Design a binder for these strands. Structure first.
Ligand SMILES: Nc1ncnc2c1ncn2[C@@H]1O[C@H](COP(=O)(O)OP(=O)(O)OP(=O)(O)O)[C@@H](O)[C@H]1O
Ligand SMILES: Nc1ncnc2c1ncn2[C@@H]1O[C@H](COP(=O)(O)OP(=O)(O)OP(=O)(O)O)[C@@H](O)[C@H]1O
Ligand SMILES: Nc1ncnc2c1ncn2[C@@H]1O[C@H](COP(=O)(O)OP(=O)(O)OP(=O)(O)O)[C@@H](O)[C@H]1O
Lengths: 311, 311, 311
DNA sequence: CTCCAGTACAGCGCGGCTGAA
DNA sequence: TTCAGCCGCGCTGTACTGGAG
């Protein structure tokens, strides 16, 4: 097996120009705030499985690894809101993640607001990264509860510290709900999936560098005329479903001692990771699926909106 | 009586290729997660009485018997959600099943989420098997309450541990409810009942190996021209109703000292376990039920959907 | 008076072949479950006043009298659900009936589920007999609330103990409501009333053995040409209305010192217990009610359904 | 004892069915 | 076909109950 080789296939990061744009703007957002005047506050959108959590994890490592190794400083944070969050819930989650208070027994919303304003300049917080902002949309109704948003404005004005709120595209309406919170978050970037297959696009060079990064020694056959077309046909732009297929195909080619990833175990990987794919979608690998013009259209505008459009 | 022989007739496991497919994928799901990166997360559908709980019990024994005998390690779990589950309810059920906390007095959903994230790497959890996923569908309305699904996504991202959620086929819409939870559960397998009678199929060899496994010494007469047609006519594919009929017929042949299972006590067993069978269905054993072409059609597509279609 | 003789007239049990069928199946249901594998789980239907409660009381005495006299063991139970039962209500009723916990102050549905799963193998429960299953049908609307049914499935799978749920025939739709609970209850028997008067049927020999069992010394005159026709004409099959008439007639013949039950006090007993009988029904005892062909028809199919058909 | 959340009952508004013009 | 009245369903407000501070 060699679980070292398996972990190498699973942990494969390839930097796209969109990710380098987000990382450059994140470094800019941090280094601009003097923690006296109002910070910059970016909002990053992005659909279900574009690689937002990978972007935050890549930034976390490249920013706070040596500083966290130095001592209890924790310069940048990573916060994942709970579903249907109250201000007290997201406040105490921000508290128990940041350093080591108890913080989650005494829930009174005011004294723990005083605690984390006492503690944010104490440890030396430089940035707050919130991952889930679509949790502030109520599930079955379409009201967006503005208590956490107003509390985020409150904690932003009280202690001037830049906040980079991530979320799905339909979380925009939560920023539309509060006009003051809308005005604060000026910088808005859309981390949207891969666009076209025509070739010599960002998708080809991405698969070229991922072909390089794969733990096979000789070639993996990606980013050619035939296989790129089949690959985009399987996974439209969704980075997770593409990486899942590539991961299952790699560990399949590792299991039965092979040269590389071939059109032997790729078909098996396609039939394995095609459960989540929609009703009308066709698997382009099986017996005789001539990959069509209609399969390779760019992803829509409302790609991450559909759950909001379902009600 | 010899309750040893009765327990032998009751505890009879025959491995079908569909069950071996599920077990191979379950072993694969476990041995792929390094518990740093995102796990694989299979979803196994299956109708009312296909042998899902038998699959989980067979896997539990063949995985965790010697490791549980070694000490308090509990590598794999078995969770059965309560009906109309809240995240706190399914969270504390996951807690009180896993090891020995108290965990079911202090219900605050946040500190017991912290407790089970503290405790999951502590004991060394390798896999979580959830049995009931159709409970998240509300009974009389058709809304699917997405609090437990969003909490399952939360606990999946917080502590990277593979979850194999079992459920009835109409629990698919609960996975369709959350687009992120849909994306996560890529591997989907359908454990569907037995297909055809025409003979030399999986049903014949299944009854051949179950004929072997029965505690009678000489023959039980199963998987021949006549009796296989009558057996499929009684129980379409439903593994439980077939096994119940075979069980009641076996213990009937054990009661009055007999050679084997014959067409003496099988008729009695048919009239015994025909209460649950639908209105238009005919018992093929009684006096003169010429077994027809129309009785031996394969089971439908929406076999485990009917309760969802009833409202 | 001699209240000994009065109690002898009131407490008269005559075993029919349908009752002996139910008792043989109950003994079978108990002695088959090894409390490791899935139990047998019979469902027994029956109209208003067929003698279900008498069957459970007869079984309770003949099973658990000496074992309850030995010590706190309580092998078999007797549960009567409350009307519009919640799982917590029927759960704590099951708890406070079984042994001696407190169990009915702390209502949280999860920890008392843990309590009775802790306690069922502790005392040594071999069988659970639930008497009222038609309470899960809502009164004025026709929805059947499936929380107690899903909890019964939960407690059946958690602690493998055979459950014999009794109820009225229109409670079948509650078993039709849950396809998993339908599957589980394979053995379904219909304890339906007495059928015909033509003579030399089960009704004649039943009145013959009840004539024997009555506390009069010489004869009671039952199960002859004339009186059997008048008896069926009064009470179609309803065991309770028949036994009530016989009871009132007996204690009338005991009051004024008489030879036996004659056509003197039987007429008075008929006019006494004819309040519940329907509008078009005629009392066949009064002055000149020539007992007709149209009176002596067998009871209908939907005998215990009428309250469901009323809405 | 007070505040927040969930459940049940009552009132108001909207949609569907029935009766009248 | 349109308007009005009655019934059913959904939303809102109100009171009662349970949990939490
Ligand atoms: N640049 C990249 N190169 C290779 N793989 C990548 C890259 N970016 C993301 N991935 C992979 O894409 C997958 C998506 O995971 P990730 O959680 O980051 O997506 P996400 O959008 O945050 O998901 P969600 O919206 O559900 O939180 C991961 O398996 C990750 O390894
Ligand atoms: N491979 C097998 N060989 C023999 N008997 C089997 C096999 N698989 C399942 N059974 C039998 O099928 C019956 C169904 O049990 P099980 O509870 O596993 O089904 P299920 O589909 O999980 O039911 P439910 O979905 O209601 O929980 C059991 O009596 C079991 O012994
Ligand atoms: N075999 C029998 N011989 C004589 N009397 C009988 C017999 N079976 C039942 N009875 C009498 O029939 C009457 C019916 O009472 P019982 O409560 O058993 O009926 P039931 O169907 O349970 O009523 P319910 O459905 O309302 O609970 C009792 O008075 C009982 O003594």
């Amino acid at each position: 097996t060699r679980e070292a080789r398996i972990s190498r296939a699973k942990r494969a990061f390839v930097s796209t120009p969109s990710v380098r744009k987000i990382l450059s703007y994140m470094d800019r957002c941090r280094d601009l705030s003097d923690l006296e005047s109002e910070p910059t506050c970016m909002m990053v959108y992005g659909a279900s499985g574009v690689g937002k959590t990978t972007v935050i994890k890549k930034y976390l490592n490249q920013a706070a690894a040596a500083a966290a190794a130095g001592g209890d400083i924790i310069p940048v944070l990573h916060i994942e809101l709970p579903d249907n969050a109250k201000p007290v819930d997201a406040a105490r989650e921000l508290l128990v993640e940041m350093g080591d208070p108890l913080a989650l027994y005494e829930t009174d919303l005011a004294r723990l607001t005083k605690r984390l304003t006492e503690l944010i300049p104490a440890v030396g917080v430089k940035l707050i990264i919130i991952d889930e902002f679509q949790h502030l949309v109520e599930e079955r109704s379409n009201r967006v509860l503005t208590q956490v948003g107003n509390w985020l404005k409150m904690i932003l004005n009280k202690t001037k510290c830049p906040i980079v709120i991530f979320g799905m595209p339909y979380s925009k309406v939560v920023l539309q709900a509060n006009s003051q919170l809308h005005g604060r978050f000026s910088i808005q970037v859309e981390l949207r999936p891969f666009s076209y297959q025509g070739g010599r696009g960002v998708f080809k060079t991405f698969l070229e560098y991922l072909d390089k990064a794969l733990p096979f020694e000789k070639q993996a056959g990606l980013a050619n005329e035939s296989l790129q077309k089949k690959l985009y046909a399987f996974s439209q732009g969704n980075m997770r479903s593409l990486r899942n297929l590539i991961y299952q195909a790699s560990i399949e080619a590792i299991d039965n001692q092979h040269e590389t990833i071939t059109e032997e175990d790729f078909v098996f990987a396609s039939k394995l990771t095609s459960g989540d794919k929609p009703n009308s979608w066709k698997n382009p690998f099986e017996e005789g699926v001539e990959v069509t013009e209609d399969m390779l259209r760019p992803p829509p505008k409302d790609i991450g909106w559909e759950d909001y459009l379902r009600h």
